[PDB]
Amino acid sequence: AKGEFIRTKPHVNVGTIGHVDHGKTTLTAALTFVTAAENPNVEVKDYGDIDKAPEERARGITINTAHVEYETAKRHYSHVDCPGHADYIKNMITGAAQMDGAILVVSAADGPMPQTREHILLARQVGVPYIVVFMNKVDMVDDPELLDLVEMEVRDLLNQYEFPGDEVPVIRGSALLALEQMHRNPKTRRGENEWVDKIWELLDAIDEYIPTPVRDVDKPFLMPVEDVFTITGRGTVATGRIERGKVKVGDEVEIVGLAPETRKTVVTGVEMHRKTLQEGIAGDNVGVLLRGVSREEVERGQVLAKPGSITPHTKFEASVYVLKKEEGGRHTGFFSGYRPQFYFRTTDVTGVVQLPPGVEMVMPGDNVTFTVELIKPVALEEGLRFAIREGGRTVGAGVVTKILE
Amino acid sequence: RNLSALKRHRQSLKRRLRNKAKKSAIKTLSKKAIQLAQEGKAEEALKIMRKAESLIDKAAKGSTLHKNAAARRKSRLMRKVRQLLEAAGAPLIGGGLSA
Amino acid sequence: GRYIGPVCRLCRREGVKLYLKGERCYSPKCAMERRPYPPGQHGQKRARRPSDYAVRLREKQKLRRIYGISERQFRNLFEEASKKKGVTGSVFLGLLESRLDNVVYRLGFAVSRRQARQLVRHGHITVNGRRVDLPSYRVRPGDEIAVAEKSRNLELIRQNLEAMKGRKVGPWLSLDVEGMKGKFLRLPDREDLALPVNEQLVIEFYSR
Amino acid sequence: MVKIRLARFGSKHNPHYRIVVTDARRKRDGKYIEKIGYYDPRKTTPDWLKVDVERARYWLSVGAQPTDTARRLLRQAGVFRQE
RNA sequence: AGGGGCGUAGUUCAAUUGGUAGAACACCGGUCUCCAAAACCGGGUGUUGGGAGUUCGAGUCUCUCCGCCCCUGCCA
RNA sequence: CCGAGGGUAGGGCCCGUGACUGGGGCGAAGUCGUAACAAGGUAGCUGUACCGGAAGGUGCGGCUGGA
RNA sequence: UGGAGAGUUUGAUCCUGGCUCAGGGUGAACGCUGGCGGCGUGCCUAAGACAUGCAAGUCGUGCGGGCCGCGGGGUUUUACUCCGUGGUCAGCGGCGGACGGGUGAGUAACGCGUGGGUGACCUACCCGGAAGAGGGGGACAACCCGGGGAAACUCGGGCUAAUCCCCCAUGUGGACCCGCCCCUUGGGGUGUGUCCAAAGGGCUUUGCCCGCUUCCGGAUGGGCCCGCGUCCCAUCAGCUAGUUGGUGGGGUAAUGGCCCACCAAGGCGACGACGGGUAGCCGGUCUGAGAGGAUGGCCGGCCACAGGGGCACUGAGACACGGGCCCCACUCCUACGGGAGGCAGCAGUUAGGAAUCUUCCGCAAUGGGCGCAAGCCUGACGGAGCGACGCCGCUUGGAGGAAGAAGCCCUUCGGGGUGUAAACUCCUGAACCCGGGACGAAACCCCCGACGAGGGGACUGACGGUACCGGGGUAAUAGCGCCGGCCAACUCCGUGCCAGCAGCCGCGGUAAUACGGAGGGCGCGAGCGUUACCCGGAUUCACUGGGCGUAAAGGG
Numbered sequence A: 001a002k003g004e005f006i007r008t009k010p011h012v013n014v015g016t017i018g019h020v021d022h023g024k025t026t027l028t029a030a031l032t033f034v035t036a037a038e039n040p041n042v043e044v045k046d047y048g049d050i051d052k053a054p055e056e057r058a059r060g061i062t063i064n065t066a067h068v069e070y071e072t073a074k075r076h077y078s079h080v081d082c083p084g085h086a087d088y089i090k091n092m093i094t095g096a097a098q099m100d101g102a103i104l105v106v107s108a109a110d111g112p113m114p115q116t117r118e119h120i121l122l123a124r125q126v127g128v129p130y131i132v133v134f135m136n137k138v139d140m141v142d143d144p145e146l147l148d149l150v151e152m153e154v155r156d157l158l159n160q161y162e163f164p165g166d167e168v169p170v171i172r173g174s175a176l177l178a179l180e181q182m183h184r185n186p187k188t189r190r191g192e193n194e195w196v197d198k199i200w201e202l203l204d205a206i207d208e209y210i211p212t213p214v215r216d217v218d219k220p221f222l223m224p225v226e227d228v229f230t231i232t233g234r235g236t237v238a239t240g241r242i243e244r245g246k247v248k249v250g251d252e253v254e255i256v257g258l259a260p261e262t263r264k265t266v267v268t269g270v271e272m273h274r275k276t277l278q279e280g281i282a283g284d285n286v287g288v289l290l291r292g293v294s295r296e297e298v299e300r301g302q303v304l305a306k307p308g309s310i311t312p313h314t315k316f317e318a319s320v321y322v323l324k325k326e327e328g329g330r331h332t333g334f335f336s337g338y339r340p341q342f343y344f345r346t347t348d349v350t351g352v353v354q355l356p357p358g359v360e361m362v363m364p365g366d367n368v369t370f371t372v373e374l375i376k377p378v379a380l381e382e383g384l385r386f387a388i389r390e391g392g393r394t395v396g397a398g399v400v401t402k403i404l405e
Numbered sequence B: 001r002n003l004s005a006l007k008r009h010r011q012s013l014k015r016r017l018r019n020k021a022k023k024s025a026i027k028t029l030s031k032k033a034i035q036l037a038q039e040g041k042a043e044e045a046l047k048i049m050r051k052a053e054s055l056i057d058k059a060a061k062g063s064t065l066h067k068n069a070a071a072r073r074k075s076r077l078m079r080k081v082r083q084l085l086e087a088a089g090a091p092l093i094g095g096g097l098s099a
Numbered sequence C: 001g002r003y004i005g006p007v008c009r010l011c012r013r014e015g016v017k018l019y020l021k022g023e024r025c026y027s028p029k030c031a032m033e034r035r036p037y038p039p040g041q042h043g044q045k046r047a048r049r050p051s052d053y054a055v056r057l058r059e060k061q062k063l064r065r066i067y068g069i070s071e072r073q074f075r076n077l078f079e080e081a082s083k084k085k086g087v088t089g090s091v092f093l094g095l096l097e098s099r100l101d102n103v104v105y106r107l108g109f110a111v112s113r114r115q116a117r118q119l120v121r122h123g124h125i126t127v128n129g130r131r132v133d134l135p136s137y138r139v140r141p142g143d144e145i146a147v148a149e150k151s152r153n154l155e156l157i158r159q160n161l162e163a164m165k166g167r168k169v170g171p172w173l174s175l176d177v178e179g180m181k182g183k184f185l186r187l188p189d190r191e192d193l194a195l196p197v198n199e200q201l202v203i204e205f206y207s208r
Numbered sequence D: 001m002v003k004i005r006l007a008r009f010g011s012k013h014n015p016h017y018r019i020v021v022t023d024a025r026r027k028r029d030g031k032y033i034e035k036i037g038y039y040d041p042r043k044t045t046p047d048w049l050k051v052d053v054e055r056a057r058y059w060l061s062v063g064a065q066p067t068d069t070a071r072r073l074l075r076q077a078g079v080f081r082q083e
Numbered sequence E: 001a002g003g004g005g006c007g008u009a010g011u012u013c014a015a016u017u018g019g020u021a022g023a024a025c026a027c028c029g030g031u032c033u034c035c036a037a038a039a040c041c042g043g044g045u046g047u048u049g050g051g052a053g054u055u056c057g058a059g060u061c062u063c064u065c066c067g068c069c070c071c072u073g074c075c076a
Numbered sequence F: 001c002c003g004a005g006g007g008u009a010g011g012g013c014c015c016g017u018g019a020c021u022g023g024g025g026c027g028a029a030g031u032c033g034u035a036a037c038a039a040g041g042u043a044g045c046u047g048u049a050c051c052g053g054a055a056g057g058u059g060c061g062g063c064u065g066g067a
Numbered sequence G: 001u002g003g004a005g006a007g008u009u010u011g012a013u014c015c016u017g018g019c020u021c022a023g024g025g026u027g028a029a030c031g032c033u034g035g036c037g038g039c040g041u042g043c044c045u046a047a048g049a050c051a052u053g054c055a056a057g058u059c060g061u062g063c064g065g066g067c068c069g070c071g072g073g074g075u076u077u078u079a080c081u082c083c084g085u086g087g088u089c090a091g092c093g094g095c096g097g098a099c100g101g102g103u104g105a106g107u108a109a110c111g112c113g114u115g116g117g118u119g120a121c122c123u124a125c126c127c128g129g130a131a132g133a134g135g136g137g138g139a140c141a142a143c144c145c146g147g148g149g150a151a152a153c154u155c156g157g158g159c160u161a162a163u164c165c166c167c168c169a170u171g172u173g174g175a176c177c178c179g180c181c182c183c184u185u186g187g188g189g190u191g192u193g194u195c196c197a198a199a200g201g202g203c204u205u206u207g208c209c210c211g212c213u214u215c216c217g218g219a220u221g222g223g224c225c226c227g228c229g230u231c232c233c234a235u236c237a238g239c240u241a242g243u244u245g246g247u248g249g250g251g252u253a254a255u256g257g258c259c260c261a262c263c264a265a266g267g268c269g270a271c272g273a274c275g276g277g278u279a280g281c282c283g284g285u286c287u288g289a290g291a292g293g294a295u296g297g298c299c300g301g302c303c304a305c306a307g308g309g310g311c312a313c314u315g316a317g318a319c320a321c322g323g324g325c326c327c328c329a330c331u332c333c334u335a336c337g338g339g340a341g342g343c344a345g346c347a348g349u350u351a352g353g354a355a356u357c358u359u360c361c362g363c364a365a366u367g368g369g370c371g372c373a374a375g376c377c378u379g380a381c382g383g384a385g386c387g388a389c390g391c392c393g394c395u396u397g398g399a400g401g402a403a404g405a406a407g408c409c410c411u412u413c414g415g416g417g418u419g420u421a422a423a424c425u426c427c428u429g430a431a432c433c434c435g436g437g438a439c440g441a442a443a444c445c446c447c448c449g450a451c452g453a454g455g456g457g458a459c460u461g462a463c464g465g466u467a468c469c470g471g472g473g474u475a476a477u478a479g480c481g482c483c484g485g486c487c488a489a490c491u492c493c494g495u496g497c498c499a500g501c502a503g504c505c506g507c508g509g510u511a512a513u514a515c516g517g518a519g520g521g522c523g524c525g526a527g528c529g530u531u532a533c534c535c536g537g538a539u540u541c542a543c544u545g546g547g548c549g550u551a552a553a554g555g556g
């Protein structure tokens, strides 16, 4: 009584970011109801169970990235719903470190806010090629030409961090209303009810523009872990979004990064939104029941590669670029004793900055060949992509140029 | 969820109900018998006894009582009805109990 | 597994010129024939008086190293010699002798026991027609040990065999130098084996 | 009732049944009444099935009920042969 | 994963108007001795938890990060 | 009638814990004295009794394992 | 065919005596290291709580039907829908669900072990003997109509079949009362009286096969009882009312205070009663010269238990692991009156802990249940998987190869070691490649023959394309402990009663074979060490086999 996942259309992960109280979640629950009627295989979610965590619920806000499944007769999507605020950025950044495309969300009444910025900024440093805006809260005071000013300054923001801002498809409407009628209108297609048709402008808007990225299942295998759950009577399940290759029940895999020595196992099962996946492929968002391992051994930040491909390494001499202060990065300099927080895939393990001979300083812009030793052995390869935050603002970005041990 | 072992249960209640009665009968019918044997009613006494020795021994054919059980009741109904028909009885109708 | 490592070094330590290479060990250089003292930074210094335990340990190591066996097998074998009837001091050697890879050595098919092994290990030998690759295999009396056909034409099988010309195998073995056969006629007696080892002591090391 | 069957022995991948009279309810390799033979389904030795007839017959003549594969063996040793 | 605490020499602890950090006992060094103990001289010996921030200058005020304790979460 | 279990009451044994309090073992070089070991400078030891910072002292009897 | 000691109290000695070491054993755990195969073996803690799936059914050759598709159209067509004949879903009826599988919580007990007793008894299915199987009557599901319910499902009315129940007859016989004979606790023969039997089903049809009924004999499996044996505390010394016995009743398959009235006053205890503690018991396991000591995990046997506590029903058998009824805790559902569950079955989760596994493959074999049989069910079982947990086998190479590279380490600066070790030259061939390819499986069944004996023929392989075999073919893992004495093995430097070692005695205070590192050496090797536990040494609870004047110990 679980059912097998029938992979028909291609899968793409889209996340939903943006400041607080701007409809991020509702707009999410919306896509559920909207895309529902016009096709089965969706399973409806509401503003309530999208945020099932007590407090998250009882208290009001969204605290953990959701994870919803809704399709179109065109393309199958997996919707990762990030939280607003700051504080939880460590949970949006992990949600973002996945999603192929980001459905940005701004509010007509408020306009681009402090978090609206950073989120976009994180997207430009996480690696979310492609953003879609969705002005929400439009059903507010007749703004003949005010909501227009939003799309004028929001685009300014996107084209302010290397994003096709002028091209970005800025749909308009309200999710509440859109939702509301649907809420009391289970069955019912588009080209009918007012606002409901405003959601589709967005959905379709996604089937287009937004890609479906160069994917391969020929290289080894890799899967950065986003979370780990203990499934009763089953065992330890680790989720994430696949990188290269594929994985099916019965395969060997190693858990690499953030521990003494890596443990190898055998996958006991795979799924995708509770659907018994027969063989998750790259770019797929899966769940992996790892044979006989404990929730004390798997941890968000390590990988699940194929045995023998990519070991854990602490010291790594890697080339790196440093965001200038104008880029909202660093406005000073660091010594050969600097200890920042790098972000490899979904994890951030703090490392040192043992700077090379003759570089008695490093300020905004710039990009030298400095070494570093992490305090937690993490799965590293040759050319891995990473960023460098600290204090509450990204400061650089580079890739492994060489590996020490 | 459930098993076709309830058939065995239902099946049971009946059989229960079955020999339950075949059993009550023998109790009552054997009381009345000695009550009349102590009283002296030699005739209508054996009349009943001999009619119980019947109901009893039939319990054995089935799964109610059985063998030595059935026989036991008897050797305490005759061994009894006889030790009563001595109270100035002279078993007139030597129906079942041989002299 | 089988020691594998410097050998004339053991030859040394023990003192008694041990034969673990066959060929060169008859040469003017068994090393023992060149530096008759124990290996190591010391080896040639006043030898203290050996505890009865040393004497026994040393006498056992001597014997055991002479076969290339591991302690596990060696002892386990000894313990069996205890149970069987008759002077175990003897039986033991008889069992150490009845070992397969050894008899391959005791027949010339191989210059040294280390070699005898590899030979046995790689099919090269044949017991009563069928081929055995178990060095540990216990040859029983009246059995025939012989080189496997696929091997006869090998540079080695030849020479070692070429040497058995005019030579005689231990009084308890028979040998057909022409056809690479050879029978395990009788279980060798303590006498028949001129070993530089006092089996009597080896028995003592294993009591207390 | 009392039966004549095979009770396993030997090692894994080396079946070595023992022909035995025993209450049907006893577990397989459990305790029996009497031992009457052995049967190596892999026949290794000109001695792959011994069976005491005299006794095998006693049991049969009292109720002992053989298995199909236990009759074949019994028979093969000629338990029924009368002439 | 989200809250809240705690980290000053060796060991207990004080300086929070923002100003190189002392107080006791330890401890090291020297003299005497085989060597200590005692005695007598002489020396804070610190990663203020790490790294940055603001600052003319941070134990203190910001922030990020490490370890530990406490509460609340957490079914592919 | 019997009857698992529940209740009211009064006992018995056990595991843990408690303000305070008794002595004990152990811990290089802190204080007081000097009881024993040589009439150990009052022969020693002992049962008992009383007294004393502490070792101990005294009484009565006993022992020699004191001369 | 069987017996070894050593270190340590002293300035030294002999004795006493304790501690400790050398051996062996383990369901191990922990550290470092880890290549292969086979056979074993793997929750010692929470008898804690557990999602999910699966672990017990099977017979139409017992019976009637519901449904789907074919034979002839009852009639001439659809109508009172009748048969022929294999698939399907329950029902009724039989036999099995009491065995197989799990566990050790409880239990100091005739629970177990051992040898006996039953004139005091039971035994389904299975064999062997004897006798029958004659007639009659009826109900209840299934199904149809109605009513209630969210659901789990239950109530009213109406038929209906049987190997279902019931009643009479026959009575080889069997049961019961009284009497006689023999025997001697209730057993064997016997007499008058009374009471009790049964079912048809399939065919190849006055005969077979399968059932049925009663009775005797036999097997197998059991109940009960008795002698003897079975841990600690006596700082547990007195215990007992169903208490001990009797008589008469109830109960049972059967003896019995097993249960009850009545009468009596007993029963038990230093030969350890009563109480408290701990514990499943044995075959066996480990150790020991033995006598002993310790132990009860694999496997086999017996007991006991199935969430906790009690109960009876059916039944040859249970007071029943995946049956029922009640109570309790707990978890779950609801349409709020009632429903659901119990992995100490398999696999698995979590909690606890130093620690103990796959949600596997297959009924091919062996065993079990039902069946005429085909065959269906079989997490028994046969296999595979994971872990050096264990034992055993196997590899990391073999033969040459210098008065002897280098690097490192000692150095009386002459030289010495690591060392044939390396390099190097050949030689072999783990791996890998290609190819064939199992044993385990002959019988159920069919055929000549009486479904007799006997003969011939056919199907069936999870493990596995594995094992094993042949062809070609690459040098292709090594670690861990230790070196003061006991105990196999020594030098340099660093450190300086510091840091640290340590099983016991002890090492370290500026030349440390004892600390840390290095070179060297010894031991073992896919392992080596550590901790824990048992026996041994320990004649150190002494039966074998000790002692007490002053060593512990003679009682005032």
Ligand SMILES: NC[C@@H]1O[C@H](O[C@H]2[C@@H](O)[C@H](O[C@@H]3[C@@H](O)[C@H](N)C[C@H](N)[C@H]3O[C@H]3O[C@H](CO)[C@@H](O)[C@H](O)[C@H]3N)O[C@@H]2CO)[C@H](N)[C@@H](O)[C@@H]1O
Pocket: F027, F030
């Ligand atoms: N274990 C000692 C027992 O207690 C008493 O002895 C205890 C004390 O009286 C004795 O004290 C002595 C003192 O007497 C002497 N004059 C000076 C010495 N420094 C102290 O020593 C004691 O204290 C020091 C710390 O100050 C510890 O390091 C030492 O180990 C300890 N024994 O030390 C003992 C504690 O270890 C009894 N007299 C003795 O008979 C008894 O067995």
Ligand SMILES: Nc1nc2c(ncn2[C@@H]2O[C@H](COP(=O)(O)OP(=O)(O)CP(=O)(O)O)[C@@H](O)[C@H]2O)c(=O)[nH]1
Pocket: A019, A020, A021, A022, A023, A024, A025, A026, A027, A060, A061, A062, A063, A082, A083, A084, A085, A136, A137, A138, A139, A173, A174, A175, A176, A177
């Ligand atoms: N007027 C208006 N209010 C809306 C709209 N969409 C959402 N809201 C309001 O915002 C509330 C919750 O918004 P939500 O979607 O959870 O915000 P969010 O983007 O998840 C903010 P965070 O994730 O950081 O907690 C709704 O209950 C509603 O009152 C809209 O389109 N118009």
Ligand SMILES: [Mg+2]
Pocket: A024, A025, A061, A062, A082, A083, A084
């Ligand atoms: Mg939200």
Ligand SMILES: [Zn+2]
Pocket: C007, C008, C011, C018, C019, C020, C021, C025, C030, C031, C032
């Ligand atoms: Zn040599």
